[PDB]
Amino acid sequence: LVRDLPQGFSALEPLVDLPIGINITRFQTLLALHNSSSGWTAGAAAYYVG
Amino acid sequence: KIADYNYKLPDDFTGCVIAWNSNNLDSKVGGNYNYQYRLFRKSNLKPFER
């Protein structure tokens, strides 16, 4: 349990190659937390990017 | 010219280019082989970008 991303080090491993020769200039992440039972509205979630 | 304005290979391309004389197919008999573009928008069309 920490206030924010804890100091430390880790390494990542690969999944796919996806050989698609296209020009990407943009990106969007989306998830629906809209509870239609009470009303459609953004929920309590967040993410980090860099 | 055919490469610069349509399809380019990288400087370090590794592999093989295989071509044969197809003079008895749609290429000669009433076909419409096209998209032989002669111009450009910015520069040579970035190798492997479609």
Curated annotation (Swiss-Prot), chain B:
Identification of the protein by name: Spike protein S1
Primary role: Attaches the virion to the cell membrane by interacting with host receptor, initiating the infection. The major receptor is host ACE2. When S2/S2' has been cleaved, binding to the receptor triggers direct fusion at the cell membrane. When S2/S2' has not been cleaved, binding to the receptor results in internalization of the virus by endocytosis using host TFRC and GRM2 and leading to fusion of the virion membrane with the host endosomal membrane. Alternatively, may use NRP1/NRP2 and integrin as entry receptors.
Stretches the record annotates as Immunodominant HLA epitope recognized by the CD8+: 32-40
Highest taxon of source: Viruses
Assembly description: Binds to host ACE2. RBD also interacts with the N-linked glycan on 'Asn-90' of ACE2. Cleavage of S generates a polybasic C-terminal sequence on S1 that binds to host Neuropilin-1 (NRP1) and Neuropilin-2 (NRP2) receptors. Interacts with host integrin alpha-5/beta-1 (ITGA5:ITGB1) and with ACE2 in complex with integrin alpha-5/beta-1 (ITGA5:ITGB1). May interact via cytoplasmic c-terminus with M protein. May interact (via N-terminus) with host bilirubin and biliverdin, thereby preventing antibody binding to the SARS-CoV-2 spike NTD via an allosteric mechanism.
Organism: Severe acute respiratory syndrome coronavirus 2 (2019-nCoV)
